[PDB]
Amino acid sequence: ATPDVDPDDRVYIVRAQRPTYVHWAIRKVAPDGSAKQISLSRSGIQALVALEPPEGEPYLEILPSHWTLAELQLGNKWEYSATNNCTHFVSSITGESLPNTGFSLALGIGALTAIAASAA
């Protein structure tokens, strides 16, 4: 509903195994069942923090206030690399140690989804 977190909202780390790498993200589920999810997408070859459709399986539940941190980084540009990827985005937010499985050796930046363009 609002930008800020509702008291009954629950936030999770989620894990989406793709062929060549693992997609890490943070999801907020509401009482009615609706969900939002934030991770790294790309525009061209430039990675950035962006909303995305819910995807992957709940990995660990975390305190809701973690969502706000991820929400505040929406739009931030990201230096995508082997040592700086989906894993590192979620680790910096949550402060939980994730295994570095969030980079594709074959696809690289091409692993990330292309962000949706202007509605106009």
Q: Helix or strand or coil: residue 93?
A: helix
Cα angle 16, 21, 23 (rounded to 5 degrees) comes to 30
Maximum separation of any 2 CA atoms in the chain, in Å = 42
How was this model experimentally determined? X-ray
The b/e string for 44-74 (b: 16+ C-beta within 10 A; e otherwise) is: eeebbbbebeebbeebeebebebbeebbebe
Resolution in A: 2.8
- What are the b/e assignments for 90-112, b being 16+ CB within 10 Å? bbebbeeebeeebbbeeebbebb
Q: Which residues pair with 48 in a beta bridge?
A: 41, 77
Residue whose tokens read 């091409």:
110
On the 0-12 / 13-18 / 19+ scale of CB atoms within 10 A, 21 is: buried
Whether 96 and 13 have beta carbons less than 8 Å apart is answered as yes
